[PDB]
Symmetry: C3
Subunit: 151 residues, 3 copies
Amino acid sequence: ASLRQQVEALQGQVQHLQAAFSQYKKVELFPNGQSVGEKIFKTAGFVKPFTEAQLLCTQAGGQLASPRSAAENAALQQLVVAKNEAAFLSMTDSKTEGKFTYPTGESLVYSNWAPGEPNDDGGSEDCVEIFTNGKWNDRACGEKRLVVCEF
Amino acid sequence: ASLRQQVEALQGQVQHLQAAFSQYKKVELFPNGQSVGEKIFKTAGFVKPFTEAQLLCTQAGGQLASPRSAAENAALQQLVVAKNEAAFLSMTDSKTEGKFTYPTGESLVYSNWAPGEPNDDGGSEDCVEIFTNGKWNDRACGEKRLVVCEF
Amino acid sequence: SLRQQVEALQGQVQHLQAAFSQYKKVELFPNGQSVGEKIFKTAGFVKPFTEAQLLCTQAGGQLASPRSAAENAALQQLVVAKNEAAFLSMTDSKTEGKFTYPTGESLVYSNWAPGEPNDDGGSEDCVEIFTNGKWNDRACGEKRLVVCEF
Ligand SMILES: CO[C@H]1O[C@H](CO)[C@@H](O)[C@H](O)[C@@H]1O
Ligand SMILES: CO[C@H]1O[C@H](CO)[C@@H](O)[C@H](O)[C@@H]1O
Ligand SMILES: CO[C@H]1O[C@H](CO)[C@@H](O)[C@H](O)[C@@H]1O
Ligand SMILES: [Ca+2]
Ligand SMILES: [Ca+2]
Ligand SMILES: [Ca+2]
Ligand SMILES: [Ca+2]
Ligand SMILES: [Ca+2]
Ligand SMILES: [Ca+2]
Ligand SMILES: [Ca+2]
Ligand SMILES: [Ca+2]
Ligand SMILES: [Ca+2]
């Protein structure tokens, strides 16, 4: 019976914590983040070449944005539109030209290539950017694009 | 007893979350947030016209800053001062000239109008801005002001 | 019954632990660094010392006060990322040649650049940290990156 008092008390504490956490999470995502499902995109708000962007996300405990569905892509698109800057995705075909993979080596399960893409322009486009319209284009890894990580 | 031991373990886990979260609350609100009572204001740090500002807030699960007491208004003022940029509030008299309402249609429970305001200058001021001195002025919705949401 | 409520509570706490851990990463990116029990966060802009100090105290923290090589290296990452030297909390405003924390305590760790502190011009009572992590005394009226600790 004293255990029941403790349980009822802990239940109230945990629910107040859930409520505070939920509020702080909305605050956290405004205006540089987007949640979609269990994934959270957050932009750093500046641009970097791919290798540097990739390092920022991994050091932060995440990875570069990797939309795996239309819904994820739409969420990511909101951030790009808000910053009005194309962003890098995580995926590259550096290992095998024409074959884009996630950092793990897995093949794409979703893509949203703009018409005519990916075209490996100049013979050297192995990174991927997402435009303000949400479509993707292969782009040289040395160009600077908005940094958006996923967690 | 096992139920007892489970409750004790939960107690320890909850204490740890409360303590860890309490620190992150402070970190999160620096430098663009302000907590007051159960409300949190958060600025995007940039300016937009009203309609755009309102959409940003509502899409983020909030609404434009709606100070409902002197205490809230002072907390909001601290952000406005820090950014040195007047901000939009949520309230308008777009529906009925002279009758300012919250986005829910409720009439105002607090106001801090500068002397002689609102004055519907030019016959077309239906939004409200808050100055760095904390006072309110009705202003054209088309103008660009600091975006500050409440959560 | 009780055993059921406990089970549900267990689920709620495990969910919060996972959600909180994910949220911590989101929060610290890109302007924060966690080191031990301390968190540094930069505002991403520069201010003169008095203004920087007030921003930190009103936010419920204080200016970055690295107390070990580990803390200094963590702080240094933010400085390197913004490519902007930052103010520390410590000053010798009260007693020239003696730098103290905002409490009044004397320094328990330092990382002065060679020759520093040198009170150049007879008026350097604040401290900046460079992208190389070394410290230099500097006029309090100059504008440097604001970084607070919590
Ligand atoms: C859309 O812009 C064009 O040029 C860029 C690189 O500059 C390409 O990546 C792209 O596929 C097009 O050919
Ligand atoms: C300086 O402020 C004046 O003009 C603006 C519009 O420019 C008004 O909203 C205000 O009430 C005053 O008439
Ligand atoms: C370039 O560095 C020198 O000048 C600055 C600015 O005055 C001093 O703080 C420093 O100790 C050196 O004398
Ligand atoms: Ca190639
Ligand atoms: Ca290629
Ligand atoms: Ca291309
Ligand atoms: Ca009108
Ligand atoms: Ca009006
Ligand atoms: Ca007016
Ligand atoms: Ca002195
Ligand atoms: Ca000095
Ligand atoms: Ca010096």
